[PDB]
Amino acid sequence: SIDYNNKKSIIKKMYIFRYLTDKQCNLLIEAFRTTRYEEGDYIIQEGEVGSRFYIIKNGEVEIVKNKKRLRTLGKNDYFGERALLYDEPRTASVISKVNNVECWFVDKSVFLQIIQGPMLAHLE
Known part of the structure; x- marks a missing residue:
């Protein structure tokens, strides 16, 4: 309940998901899972092909x-969105700044299956 409503609130108001149907959005919210990082962990490595999106x-x-810090992101910020459309090398790294970092993430595999939904054929 609380975790669902938490990420629901964030996800639904996000620009990059503004074209999703309520049906798609619900599948999407349920698709996100939590992942944990400790201080100094590489969440994203520059030059690898990205496949996840993080909140x-x-x-x-x-x-x-x-080796230069470009910016700091905090609670409810998000990063990596290009990976949900494009297959390309990451342009920078993302490093966990503190211990006990938690992100919701989804893989493009799951996301694309959801965006594909309206293309799937009815029997009638």
């Missing part, structure tokens, strides 16, 4: 390129 539940992360 910060607890904590902070930093976006890093060429």
Whole structure:
């Protein structure tokens, strides 16, 4: 309940999901799962092909390129959205800034199956 309503509230108001149907959105909310990181963990590694999208539940992360911090993201911020449409190398790294970081994430595998929904044929 609480975790569902939590990510529901965030997901539903996000720009990048504004075209989803309520049916799609519900599948999507249920598809997100929590993942935990400790201080200094690489959440995303620059140069790898991205396949996940992340929303910060607890904590902070930093976006890093060429060992330089580009910015800090905190609770309810999100990152990695291009991976949900494009198959391309990550342009930067994302590093867990503190212990006990928690993100909701979804893989493009799951997301695309959901976006595909309206293309699936009815019997009648």
